[PDB]
Amino acid sequence: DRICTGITSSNSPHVVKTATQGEVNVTGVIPLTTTPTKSHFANLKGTETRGKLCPKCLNCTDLDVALGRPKCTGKIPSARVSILHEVRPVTSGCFPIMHDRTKIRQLPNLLRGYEHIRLSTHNVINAENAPGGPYKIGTSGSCPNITNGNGFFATMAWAVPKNDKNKTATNPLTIEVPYICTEGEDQITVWGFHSDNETQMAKLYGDSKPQKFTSSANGVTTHYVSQIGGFPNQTEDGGLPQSGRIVVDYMVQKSGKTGTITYQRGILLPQKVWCASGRSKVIKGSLPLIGEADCLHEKYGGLNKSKPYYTGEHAKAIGNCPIWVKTPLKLANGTKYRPPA
Amino acid sequence: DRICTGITSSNSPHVVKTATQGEVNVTGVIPLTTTPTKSHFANLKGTETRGKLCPKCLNCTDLDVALGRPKCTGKIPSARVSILHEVRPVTSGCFPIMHDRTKIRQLPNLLRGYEHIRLSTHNVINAENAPGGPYKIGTSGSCPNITNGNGFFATMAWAVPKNDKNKTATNPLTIEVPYICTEGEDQITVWGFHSDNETQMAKLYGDSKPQKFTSSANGVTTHYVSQIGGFPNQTEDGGLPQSGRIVVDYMVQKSGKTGTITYQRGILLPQKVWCASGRSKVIKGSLPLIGEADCLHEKYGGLNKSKPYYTGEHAKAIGNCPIWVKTPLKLANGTKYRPPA
Amino acid sequence: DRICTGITSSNSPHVVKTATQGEVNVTGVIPLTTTPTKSHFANLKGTETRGKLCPKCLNCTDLDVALGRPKCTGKIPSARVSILHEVRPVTSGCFPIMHDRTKIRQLPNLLRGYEHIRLSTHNVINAENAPGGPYKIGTSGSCPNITNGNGFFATMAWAVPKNDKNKTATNPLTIEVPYICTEGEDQITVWGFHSDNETQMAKLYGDSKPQKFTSSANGVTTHYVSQIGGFPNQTEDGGLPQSGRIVVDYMVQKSGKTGTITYQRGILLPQKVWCASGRSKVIKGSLPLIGEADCLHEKYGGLNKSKPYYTGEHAKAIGNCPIWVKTPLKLANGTKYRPPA
Amino acid sequence: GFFGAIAGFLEGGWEGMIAGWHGYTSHGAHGVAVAADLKSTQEAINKITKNLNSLSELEVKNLQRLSGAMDELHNEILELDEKVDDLRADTISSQIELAVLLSNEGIINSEDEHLLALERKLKKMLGPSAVEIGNGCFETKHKCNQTCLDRIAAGTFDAGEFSLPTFDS
Amino acid sequence: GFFGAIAGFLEGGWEGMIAGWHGYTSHGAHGVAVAADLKSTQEAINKITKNLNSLSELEVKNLQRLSGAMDELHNEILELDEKVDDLRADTISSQIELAVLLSNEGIINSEDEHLLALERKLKKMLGPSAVEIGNGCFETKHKCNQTCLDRIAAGTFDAGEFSLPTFDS
Amino acid sequence: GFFGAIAGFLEGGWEGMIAGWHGYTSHGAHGVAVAADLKSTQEAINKITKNLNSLSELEVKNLQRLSGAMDELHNEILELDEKVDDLRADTISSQIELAVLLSNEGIINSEDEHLLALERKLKKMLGPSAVEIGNGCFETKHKCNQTCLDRIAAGTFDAGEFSLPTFDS
Ligand SMILES: *[C@@H]1O[C@H](CO)[C@@H](O[C@@H]2O[C@H](CO)[C@@H](O[C@@H]3O[C@H](CO)[C@@H](O)[C@H](O)[C@@H]3O)[C@H](O)[C@H]2NC(C)=O)[C@H](O)[C@H]1NC(C)=O
Ligand SMILES: *[C@@H]1O[C@H](CO)[C@@H](O[C@@H]2O[C@H](CO)[C@@H](O[C@@H]3O[C@H](CO)[C@@H](O)[C@H](O)[C@@H]3O)[C@H](O)[C@H]2NC(C)=O)[C@H](O)[C@H]1NC(C)=O
Ligand SMILES: *[C@@H]1O[C@H](CO)[C@@H](O[C@@H]2O[C@H](CO)[C@@H](O[C@@H]3O[C@H](CO)[C@@H](O)[C@H](O)[C@@H]3O)[C@H](O)[C@H]2NC(C)=O)[C@H](O)[C@H]1NC(C)=O
Ligand SMILES: *[C@@H]1O[C@H](CO)[C@@H](O[C@@H]2O[C@H](CO)[C@@H](O[C@@H]3O[C@H](CO)[C@@H](O)[C@H](O)[C@@H]3O)[C@H](O)[C@H]2NC(C)=O)[C@H](O)[C@H]1NC(C)=O
Ligand SMILES: *[C@@H]1O[C@H](CO)[C@@H](O[C@@H]2O[C@H](CO)[C@@H](O[C@@H]3O[C@H](CO)[C@@H](O)[C@H](O)[C@@H]3O)[C@H](O)[C@H]2NC(C)=O)[C@H](O)[C@H]1NC(C)=O
Ligand SMILES: *[C@@H]1O[C@H](CO)[C@@H](O[C@@H]2O[C@H](CO)[C@@H](O[C@@H]3O[C@H](CO)[C@@H](O)[C@H](O)[C@@H]3O)[C@H](O)[C@H]2NC(C)=O)[C@H](O)[C@H]1NC(C)=O
Ligand SMILES: *[C@@H]1O[C@H](CO)[C@@H](O[C@@H]2O[C@H](CO)[C@@H](O)[C@H](O)[C@H]2NC(C)=O)[C@H](O)[C@H]1NC(C)=O
Ligand SMILES: *[C@@H]1O[C@H](CO)[C@@H](O[C@@H]2O[C@H](CO)[C@@H](O)[C@H](O)[C@H]2NC(C)=O)[C@H](O)[C@H]1NC(C)=O
Ligand SMILES: *[C@@H]1O[C@H](CO)[C@@H](O[C@@H]2O[C@H](CO)[C@@H](O)[C@H](O)[C@H]2NC(C)=O)[C@H](O)[C@H]1NC(C)=O
Ligand SMILES: *[C@@H]1O[C@H](CO)[C@@H](O[C@@H]2O[C@H](CO)[C@@H](O)[C@H](O)[C@H]2NC(C)=O)[C@H](O)[C@H]1NC(C)=O
Ligand SMILES: *[C@@H]1O[C@H](CO)[C@@H](O[C@@H]2O[C@H](CO)[C@@H](O)[C@H](O)[C@H]2NC(C)=O)[C@H](O)[C@H]1NC(C)=O
Ligand SMILES: *[C@@H]1O[C@H](CO)[C@@H](O)[C@H](O)[C@H]1NC(C)=O
Ligand SMILES: *[C@@H]1O[C@H](CO)[C@@H](O)[C@H](O)[C@H]1NC(C)=O
Ligand SMILES: *[C@@H]1O[C@H](CO)[C@@H](O)[C@H](O)[C@H]1NC(C)=O
Ligand SMILES: *[C@@H]1O[C@H](CO)[C@@H](O)[C@H](O)[C@H]1NC(C)=O
Ligand SMILES: *[C@@H]1O[C@H](CO)[C@@H](O)[C@H](O)[C@H]1NC(C)=O
Ligand SMILES: *[C@@H]1O[C@H](CO)[C@@H](O)[C@H](O)[C@H]1NC(C)=O
Ligand SMILES: *[C@@H]1O[C@H](CO)[C@@H](O)[C@H](O)[C@H]1NC(C)=O
Ligand SMILES: *[C@@H]1O[C@H](CO)[C@@H](O)[C@H](O)[C@H]1NC(C)=O
């Protein structure tokens, strides 16, 4: 009688890849892959997650909070992760802005990038004493404050030149914007200007013709020139009809460096100013953030880590994540297919 | 008598790298490597390949097509692959442009980046009714049309202020440039201005002094000021001597967003406009494209895939390509070198 | 009697990672890792190493050399490796510059990027014959020369409009800046302007109001406007009190391409000009460079290559370097731990 | 593998054993008996599970939007970002695929060697009552039925029962 | 490999066999006979070819000019593009080199094991007419010439011809 | 490894041998003798050293500041630079870790096979005076003390001294 050694034979539907034997059929396999499913976004496990610049500033958008619109002010808390919900962010009121004529729209998404943000205290410059003659400070309905009644953006002062007096047109006046923030913070300065009816222009300031403006901060120079006649229909504004409009821009000032603005009649000189440091890891999501997830995928939203790798649409993802793979992969758990004998 | 087991001894010139045994001499090898040879550029196997913006507009360069020079217009077909032949593109005619004063020269290479390109229909703005008083539209020899005789670029309208009338100098007029394209298309607007003799300037427009210009489209601001006296000798132009010259710039308008231009006398207001979508994979080649290749290498031109990897100069390459490797590699086909006994 | 085969038992403190057996204790190990120690910066073994733009121009900082401050001129030798010591470079003298109003401070770090740098010969333009009427050329104390007494930056000429004559305000004059360098060299042009007391302005030039300026070089447009009244307290200057100040900017001109500047009263027209080619591999170090090292690490300074890999703070490093690793790794030199029997 | 094909080890297996992955077979006029060895199978399972943990402890950096980007303003920079992301995912994927391929190669090639060890364990409890065939087989002087084979599978086989020379313990 | 050096397997090979990569040898007063085994060689060739296909199925993303670049305008971005390309080609190259190195290691180390299987196939057709030397050799009671050896290489060797105990089939 | 556990090779080693990594043992009423084999150890040491050189010849591109950068002006580009650096270091690190892991796997798995070769070298100098147990052991008809074992370790053992059939050389 003979006694030999042998291996099993069974149903072997699963296929695996091998350098020496080529592609073989195998008893069993342990899959390492998953194709996750699109779900809503959520709160990243270990970490702060910032959706809205300040929550608790109700009926305020992030642009609103950024521009310092009256009644939108509050603690903007800090996060190591932020979600970018508005690709083209909007104002929810105050005075009509011509948004699209400057980069101003992205200001919130910029602030978002940082871990730590904070409106300043005081003012980076005294508007009333600025160059060009004493200024009364302008306010407008559509910008109500804690009380109610005429106000403006915290972020800037509307320099109207006092009263009849020396009111007239000037050549460009130049102004330095002091640093004002601490340590290693970036200082983001918000500023701009205002135009009106041809007759209203001569009523307000001394001048009918257009006025011209310049910002310079550490290598980055920009230039603007005003519109006199009819503007675009008002939009994203506070709702009261006005004949004039407003252009708003921001300028970033590096860590320590000062900045410059040149202007003629109608200038909005910056007052309160953004102070930012640290950095937050931003992804493209869409509120609300529901629950917790291990992972936040730009395509798939919330995700929980199941198998080490996944197949599917690849994009930016933060948190404890499975790794993206070209093909669904199998680890072999079993034997090579053996025909019975 | 004794019977043993043994392996071969033979000439073993080929060397191979192993982790355990170090570098060993071996019976034979299968080379995985090639050093390919510089050839001319070809058509990519599976795919469209765009050389020239529109072929069939003959005696027309890409820049000519792009600026809409009379008689250069045609179907610019679509490509998933384009080749960038002109690193500093050139006009073949029309009116003298001072090219280096703006980014204008890259316009064709910009258009090339997209998969789908088309000139528009109608006009993004009525030049004659524009702000600053009724305008007659200027044309010049050197810009002949289907018929022959005076014309200009399709792309813009040369606004010459009517006749004596109210002809004089104005402060900057502002203008909105409407979106005009479809869906998710980028809209590329071409515009510019014109200067001349000191006396010619006073003949044409009301003004001798220089005029100033501004473009603003979604964050990107630019500023220009004119030259009055003698300009550079004319170049790349249509060949007729003129006292004046022309500055041309383009501004890209994002998907949906509008754009702005401010101007004084001598403005060329944009008329037809580029509309682009999709994206084409651009490489640096040199026409003509001869035959078919598997691969297009920026250094080696046309290439056919032979071995899996290649040694040589590495650069950007599209199509079915061999992979670049540091050293020529050999897979071992054989036995370890054995001295005879 | 029985004779068997066996392996060793001994103290096995070292741990190693294996795919099949999991993490095991082992007889001995060869460590592949090191955590290097922060040292000072050295000379790179095989290669030139540029610290200071030109050494031997003594009491001169890199910015001084770059601006062409009198008595700072000398051979700026060439390097395949350069070190960036000054993140916000400084002038040691000459005339007071308001540095932060333009990108000027980076000029030395720009020059540093290239392998080959040289100041030019002759001048890119005749200042005295420039547009706007014949100019006497201005010099000031605080800018002494080989001899001593009044001078200025080599880099530019201070155009003061002759004498009483036709001295008055002009509209912007335009100017072309010729290419002047060789072959495939980049040509960096330095220019700027000068303001003063309101009364001094009318004494020097014909004009009290501010003057405006424009640079355009191959796609990059910049605009400036002057300050009339009181400036910042003088700084980094040559030490003599002056009522006026100076703004300095540079503009790069691609390989072959020309450039433009427009100006009113107080222009500094560029004279000598930077000519650069090649490229140097720049790292962030801090002089002095002491001795030789195999490697230069941005964090650790000088380094000698010991083991193939290192653990620690990762940053930019040039030269023969160990490779950065997540964890200290061990190669197994020994046997699996065996309990005695 | 190549070993089984060369040495003459049985091409193809028996479907009789659902008990384990590897085992032993009995021939004769008593029919054909089949049994399985659990320690071999368990060892295989451990190789594999540990292997999996090794694959699963791989860690890689996150790839999120860069913070100074600005969709409207700097698209070109942004396009390059996209480029670096895609390139990363690709490379890392290739690396993983390799790790797996190697791992599977090991798992499958080792299976002949398992059999080669089973051989040595069987040789252990016989005595020189059987000759080494080299086929992975032996010829025993007695006959072995199913109950007899389960006792070798359990390792409890020592034959003084069929009285033949014993290898002492 | 290490195995051949330790166990006493012959250091160095015979140049007599151009027929295949691995084989068998006969000694005695009849001279020295040499023969080759084709199945071993064929198996080796298959390991290698399949290995090659595995190497050849690697796929990687394209690396072309980015489309918003603009040579004149944005050089710095462009410099960084160049950087990312170079970095890619380097990393991926290293990965490939590794895959190859491993592969070759397998191909060369396996060659001792081939011999170790050939041993078992030879042992198969003898009977206990020869003793296992452990040297990879046996001592046969008869003499074997070339024609006798070609029949073992062909696997057709069964000796009742030299009449000695047969392993039954 | 799995082989030692399955085949019945001794679980755990002897601490008596500081001489080498692998060796041989003698049992009986003479006590328990232990000896080491230097060629096996030396071979192992070579596998390892060569392996190390292979790991040490890896070369990777430099990663320095890009030259058109400008800290003040282009921060965003610069942030992306940072990104590409970090991503590089990560990927390359993972690759290295893999190479090492594989290498260690080889080094440790090979150790059973070493023993398996030592078996064949021992079998060489006996004669059929001992039977193959398959346990990696043999039963010799005589007794072997320490001095007797050192001579087998040195490879100088040939027994006509204990007079039993010799394998001729
Ligand atoms: C919210 O809005 C109201 C108006 O809607 C603000 O009240 C205004 O306060 C300013 C000073 O803060 C008053 O200006 C003052 O005018 C008087 C002369 O009447 C003069 O003596 C002062 O020197 C100063 O110029 C202004 O009259 C007043 N408006 C009214 C109609 O009461 C209020 O300050 C806002 N709340 C906050 C906290 O911002
Ligand atoms: C923008 O400029 C226009 C003129 O170009 C200004 O128009 C003025 O608008 C107001 C409101 O519609 C008119 O006031 C009303 O007039 C009637 C009759 O005089 C009077 O009964 C009402 O009590 C009231 O005052 C005003 O007449 C009209 N002016 C003209 C020339 O038609 C408008 O005020 C300007 N906006 C800005 C902010 O200055
Ligand atoms: C190609 O070029 C020719 C000229 O070289 C163009 O012909 C011109 O056409 C315009 C109208 O399209 C004519 O202007 C008209 O002037 C008459 C008065 O004579 C007036 O009644 C009209 O209201 C209009 O202002 C212009 O005279 C005419 N030039 C000549 C000398 O015939 C032609 O249109 C161009 N072809 C195309 C299709 O663009
Ligand atoms: C650029 O401005 C110059 C003046 O600075 C203009 O010069 C004019 O050029 C034309 C052509 O050379 C001259 O016309 C010819 O004059 C002769 C004699 O008067 C006449 O016989 C010819 O039939 C013809 O008209 C013209 O005299 C000359 N003007 C002067 C002051 O010398 C030129 O026209 C200007 N170009 C532009 C586009 O306006
Ligand atoms: C180094 O510095 C010295 C002064 O410390 C420079 O000498 C100066 O040279 C300028 C002309 O280059 C002289 O200006 C001239 O004034 C005379 C009237 O005295 C006038 O005829 C000329 O038209 C011109 O305006 C200036 O007087 C002279 N300073 C002195 C006191 O000699 C010297 O040029 C500098 N070296 C170099 C090569 O830059
Ligand atoms: C900047 O403008 C101021 C005026 O706004 C200029 O002030 C002048 O400065 C000098 C030096 O302090 C004064 O000169 C001294 O005056 C006394 C008395 O007249 C005389 O004894 C001295 O010999 C000397 O000249 C000058 O009087 C003063 N002017 C006035 C209006 O106070 C200064 O010169 C200007 N700087 C520039 C570079 O032009
Ligand atoms: C190896 O694996 C594959 C599993 O897909 C088997 O091939 C499939 O057999 C099923 C039976 O219904 C068919 O429906 C599929 O179309 C087949 N797949 C393809 C596309 O090849 C194969 O039979 C297995 N081999 C075995 C059983 O050993
Ligand atoms: C990821 O895993 C956890 C598993 O607990 C999920 O979080 C829980 O969700 C359920 C509701 O479905 C609650 O009862 C638990 O209290 C939640 N835990 C916490 C701390 O939030 C989470 O929803 C999972 N995400 C998925 C499935 O995508
Ligand atoms: C192993 O391979 C190399 C193949 O280059 C052999 O070394 C070369 O021998 C040739 C003989 O003409 C010389 O011309 C070369 O200069 C040698 N190369 C170098 C630089 O070493 C070597 O002989 C081979 N070993 C063998 C035959 O087993
Ligand atoms: C395997 O290696 C580790 C080496 O760290 C040994 O575990 C350590 O034992 C020391 C003895 O003093 C302790 O101080 C450490 O706290 C232990 N490390 C940890 C955190 O586990 C282990 O004993 C070794 N195994 C052996 C000896 O085979
Ligand atoms: C790197 O290695 C070399 C080893 O020679 C060191 O350079 C030497 O430094 C010593 C002084 O400590 C001098 O005596 C030698 O003349 C130097 N050689 C040269 C050519 O410079 C170098 O200091 C080492 N760097 C380290 C340790 O970080
Ligand atoms: C928010 O705005 C809405 C819509 O105008 C209004 O109905 C609601 O009362 C507001 N809520 C608060 C808290 O002011
Ligand atoms: C602006 O409002 C008027 C009605 O007051 C309307 O006729 C016109 O279409 C509006 N314009 C825009 C830009 O919608
Ligand atoms: C193309 O036009 C140029 C002048 O612009 C001329 O030199 C050449 O002859 C023209 N070719 C054709 C075919 O007419
Ligand atoms: C322009 O043309 C004139 C001849 O009419 C010539 O003298 C001069 O050199 C030319 N200028 C240039 C820029 O070539
Ligand atoms: C690539 O292959 C085809 C073979 O038919 C040929 O048309 C083409 O010219 C080849 N290109 C080369 C050889 O570079
Ligand atoms: C360098 O400047 C210092 C400080 O002003 C001075 O003491 C020294 O004499 C100067 N050296 C030279 C070479 O001019
Ligand atoms: C400038 O100098 C004066 C003294 O002359 C001093 O009072 C003032 O504080 C200084 N200003 C600055 C910017 O330090
Ligand atoms: C196997 O043989 C034994 C006697 O040696 C007997 O006890 C047992 O029943 C047999 N098994 C079967 C199922 O035939």
Ligand SMILES: *[C@@H]1O[C@H](CO)[C@@H](O)[C@H](O)[C@H]1NC(C)=O
């Ligand atoms: C080998 O021996 C056989 C007899 O067993 C004989 O037929 C044959 O000719 C021999 N071969 C040679 C070439 O000696």
Ligand SMILES: *[C@@H]1O[C@H](CO)[C@@H](O)[C@H](O)[C@H]1NC(C)=O
């Ligand atoms: C081993 O036995 C031999 C005799 O065969 C003897 O010479 C030697 O002394 C013995 N060794 C020991 C230490 O017992």
